[PDB]
Amino acid sequence: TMYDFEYLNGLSYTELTNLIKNIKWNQINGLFNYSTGSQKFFGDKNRVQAIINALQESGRTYTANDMKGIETFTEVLRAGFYLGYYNDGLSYLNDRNFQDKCIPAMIAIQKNPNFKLGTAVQDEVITSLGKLIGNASANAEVVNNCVPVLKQFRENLNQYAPDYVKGTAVNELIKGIEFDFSGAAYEKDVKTMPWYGKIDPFINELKALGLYGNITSATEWASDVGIYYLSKFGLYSTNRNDIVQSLEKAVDMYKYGKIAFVAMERITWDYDGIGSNGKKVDHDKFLDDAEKHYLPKTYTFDNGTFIIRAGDKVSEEKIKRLYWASREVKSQFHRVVGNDKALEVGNADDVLTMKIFNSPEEYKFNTNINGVSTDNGGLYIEPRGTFYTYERTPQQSIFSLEELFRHEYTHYLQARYLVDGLWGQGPFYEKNRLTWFDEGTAEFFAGSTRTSGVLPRKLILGYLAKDKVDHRYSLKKTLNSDDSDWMFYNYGFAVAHYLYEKDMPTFIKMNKAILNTDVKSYDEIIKKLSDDANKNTEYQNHIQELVDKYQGAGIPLVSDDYLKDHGYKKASEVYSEISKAASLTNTSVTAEKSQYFNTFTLRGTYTGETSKGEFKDWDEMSKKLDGTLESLAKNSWSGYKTLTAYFTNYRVTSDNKVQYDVVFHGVLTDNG
Template structure:
């Protein structure tokens, strides 16, 4: 048996920083850096959305995409984190009581239920069962039909008057609304008419009108979920008195600041106020239902939180979000706008300079009032920004003759280690994809890495310095050629800084060398969410890049798949959208599977990207999604990899430390590299030289002698490494 091979070999010549530059007082920055403040993050970090949550960016062509608070998306992340009991600060537990009815169940079970049986299933299922409906498919569409939304509304109307007895049933029905209206926003195939919306809103109002809901000792689980669901259904504007009551209750007892659930409920009130007022202002301006409708007492209740100087590290985000609501109040009529201006000025004068609340007040005063203080005076924004840069990002390191720049709080040793990591990613990216030239229109010759020293610094300084959202683990702004992230500890994130940087750096390489057009741009391969699974899967896959072991499977992805009750199919993966984050791990492992067992499909996939051919790409997706044997092989690959992981017998990315970039290679060493390649590979190949990298391309025909092609490729890769 004979096989014809064409191998592209890439060898990199690199240089590293040899010293530390002095901090720049006024480093270059995108224009308008202070005019787009974003909502501060809350107390919760959703592990499943850490890398690229759709509500928080991950990869955006321009900053406006990253600044936008996506409707309902973040509420889903918060709810998922609360259920998982995964607070980023402050502890607390959101685990489901063991007395709840148990599964198993699937979205198909909900789709099959009708009438009273459907209502009962929603009202008595575990959260784990209800969570099956977050992953959208045809069964979910049936389950969240307008008719079922109306059925749940009718049930809530009947059960709400006996609120304490029915508290958990009501909570689950409210949770169903959160899921349903989330999909209504993201899925074009889900549409609710005005009567359906009105019924859902009225159901939320009925719950809010019950005197037992907001008391000294409320049914916290129901109240907390209801605060999310009134936002999901856009019912908040009819429930301002209840929102005020929740905020006043929080402020009435200093001990609430130390209570996770109390902070969460206050945050959800503020989140809904800010998002709803902002959305309605964008949609209707003076026609907003909030215009001339917010009572001074509600402004005052939010103001108490905005001016709280006794906050702790756990409760600071409540203060930040109260200030953000003041920013939103400034969109309203003059009386409310003046009151917000006054409170923001008080916050600027009251809070510790350069603290999170102080910078939040500065940012909001700049956006809404051009930096003018209430009663007279103005902010020196240029000096403030210079001061904050010196505090947050004091170091600048240059690599690769200035083509890679770090603006950071980390030291040079850490920067060198991160440089080594992304060199491994870059090398494997070029080898696997065969891409070397930038796509037409890409201008990101220089990449800037902005890395803060901690999650707290990222939260405090990023909105002020760059006007970007911080409810993410990192984000690549394609239009700026800049990647933002922060250092973190294992207690703060399941992903290390290096893993995050490897992931986001892949987005940079992918957008520069493979995908024509800007992220999300209409008329490109991005249109219609076509590249969602590909972008994130490739990034998750290349996190496992090594210098001498190719791209290794990642144990963390396989470990999470091993606990999934239902696995995503190839069809699920290739049609995934950002409505769910489960696909990240499956798409990453799918790339590993293609590399190991179906390199022909992987090559075809990269060729379609390089060719910028939508027709070819869609046909390839259809082929993969409808190939039963491919599905069987993929399932078997996952099972085999999980077995190796659990037995401790396989080699995984986590087992191989990052290797330092060689420092012995001289500049302009093309001849040295060519001689080395020809000593181990056939002669007569074509040697291409690019800036800081080389490609040696050759072909050979070789007998396999019954050896599987994937084994031959692996052994060849080892020689090349």
């Protein structure tokens, strides 16, 4: 039941056409393939004509039960024109004049009483017709005959548009006609087409579909097709402004929904961005208004250097937590990195803007508004200082808003304080180096806590619960990556945590390398780690130790204690009490105004005893400082529970005394 061209070419036309009528197109071997047999088959102007005629007779007789092989009769012809496009010698099939020979057959299908939606056959006939037009020709007479089908589809819009078959049929029918028409007037004058100004009944049928109004989630696409192709076919309308008016009506009708954005795109691209009144439509303003609709609320923190623009449905509690969460990750990150001063002067990240949508659905419009992928839980655009996300439920996503935010916040920090230059575009990216690092350390810093350094996050330990066999990445494999499975980031984290807990010296040396822009240093470290097999066993067991921690693991989240009304504490007191408790010298402070509270940032020097070595110093400094935060929180002022602290710029005095710049940040309830 599988046929070759070298068999079909020997058959009579009468025999051939009859055969095609009762076989499927895929039964022909190499139909769309260019062969010596294919060239010979379609090279016969009479044979193709016989096929065209056989189609015409099939279209004149077909019923609801039998298709009379119209699908097969259309695909062979499609193969003909397709091969006539890409190969010389069949270039007569490329000429539209010959393609017009299909129109008499097309008309026959349309004049059949069975030319409507109904049974699977009837639907596939419209589909097959539509696909043919795209490769062949349409004139205007055939276009206008599609009206009763569009009317039929439109009249039962709420029943047919959710189905794939009928829906696909109408879409293919329109899409195909548009394809033929545009390609015909590619650079030619539009005013000189055989159909120009004659397809008004068809155009009007698209207005009706496009401007349907009463749409659901199931039928939105249908009116979308209506509007999109109202614009496209409207180019062949004797009235420009009439169409534009309908497109303007589409905007007003479905305001700040998919079809609004489509209609506005249609005005700017198809109609020079000129209104029906004849004045330039301000597309920017539309997007500006659309964003204000979805992000109506603003919350300003840190003297305006931390702005959350958010949907009307996102809780004010979350807004506050997200501020406080930023402050934890910040502190932990700064401890490990040892720099809090920004690398570049006058950047975007001087203001961190976060745009949070009400939900994933509403989130999608961001890509219309700000032109950034929205196929994600959230995204940090560095050149903009901007983090786009949406509030989510526990069902919509397994990460929550804060869990996600803590993760992405780290990317802002990495770009601002760690990687000199444009993030992803420096010497460190000339080769694949930081793939595990950037994504890995961020999964990791998301685990930040107020008084307990950085902890692992349950859910991630949850992933590592899988097959120990192979699968579990080696230290060599993790550091060096084009393709790698989703688990790559989970083992990337396993490294960052391994280094943190089991080997700080390395982890610190690594960050200093990035910080100082020393690729040579960084590579030497990655080489040492990958070449040493003992460091892999250290790592392999640590992954097991993380898998061991999962059962009783938590998710680091900002505490309810942050949101409490702490009450007035005098400013001068807080500073003194902190300065003494942390043995700080030469202190200065800045107060910053926020939306719901004020905050202070205390900057001091701490000089300790004699040095125990950089990395032992860091460990002790951490323990001493986390100790100072916990002791201050034993005080009666609830405010000390909002405190976060870090230390940077490690050095040693002429007399070998430990030295750090130390920073405290917390709530300020004193106004004066």
